Design a protein around this ligand. Structure first.
Ligand code: U9X
Ligand code: NA
Length: 254
């Protein structure tokens, strides 16, 4: 297929409201689970023609997946997508909206940036317990609120392959190496210039563009709407910047 010079999943599939939703992982290293349930929510809606229009529970995946790593201390993408295929994930929104089966237990906080929420700080929550119970007001039993995928896969470490996957099947999850200067990001096209590694981060790629001849990926972060560009950031595209093209994972419902 011919790849357009820009693409925005929010513009292709505007009925799928999850695609334009920015979440907040709070005082928890649950980026791996947020990028997963966000892209899964998007792809569930896109690949079902808008029939499965849901917000999947970050806390269900975070608390119940035994193979996904260390919970709030960080996790692993492949096993998150396998969990969705095999066990599936219930619905659940933010602490503040408290919709769906299992809403997130942790409140919105600022991630090394200024704004209207309390600062996240340096102290981490304990990983929540796997409770397998829908909130009292939600009248579907937990097991019957599960949304499952059919397949999960890593995407080839090829710019055009990543672009074709996003354009055909929807937003993808992606890992990258976070350096200290990423914490100073306010706007524009990020590339690593200063600072030491802080480990890995997992995000959702929703599209791509070019500004002043500089190509970028358009990415949803899970640090609330005050961070970056109303919750989004852009990062150099085509040079495997911070390994952004090398840890892409996704999957399909059919
Ligand atoms: C989510 C990313 C994140 O929340 N943060 C940052 O990247 C930087 C931050 O603030 C300075 C925040 C909050 C932290 C201070 C806690 C999450 C921490 N990252 C991960 O889960 C990544 C995801 C991949 C796909 C990039 N993976 C890891 O951290 C892995 C997880 C284990 C289970 C393998 O852990 C490590 O890389 C590492 C070792 C266990 C490696 C043998 N540690 C735990 C950093
Ligand atoms: Na901002």
């Amino acid at each position: 297929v011919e790849i357009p010079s820009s693409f925005d999943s929010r513009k292709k599939w505007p009925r799928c409201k999850s695609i334009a939703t920015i979440r907040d992982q709070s005082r928890c290293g649950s980026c791996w689970a947020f990028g997963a349930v966000e892209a899964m929510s998007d792809r569930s809606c896109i690949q079902s023609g808008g029939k499965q229009n849901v917000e999947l529970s970050a806390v269900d995946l975070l608390s119940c997946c035994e193979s996904c790593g260390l919970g709030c201390e960080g996790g692993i993408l492949g096993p998150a997508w396998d969990y969705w295929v095999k066990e599936g994930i219930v619905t659940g929104s933010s602490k503040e909206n408290h919709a769906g089966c299992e809403p997130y237990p942790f409140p919105k906080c600022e991630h090394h940036t200024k704004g209207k929420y309390p600062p996240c700080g340096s102290k981490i929550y304990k990983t929540p317990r796997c409770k397998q119970t829908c909130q009292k007001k939600y009248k579907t039993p937990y097991t019957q609120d599960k949304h499952r995928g059919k397949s999960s896969y890593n995407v080839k470490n090829d710019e055009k392959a990543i672009q074709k996957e996003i354009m055909k099947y929807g937003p993808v999850e992606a890992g990258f190496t976070v350096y200290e200067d990423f914490l100073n990001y306010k706007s524009g096209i990020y590339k690593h210039i200063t600072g030491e590694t802080l480990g890995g981060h997992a995000i959702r790629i929703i599209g791509w563009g070019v500004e002043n001849k500089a190509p970028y990926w358009l990415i949803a972060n899970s640090w609330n709407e005050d961070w970056g560009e109303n919750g989004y950031f852009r990062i150099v595209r085509g040079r495997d910047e911070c390994s952004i093209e090398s840890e892409v994972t996704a999957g399909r419902i059919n």
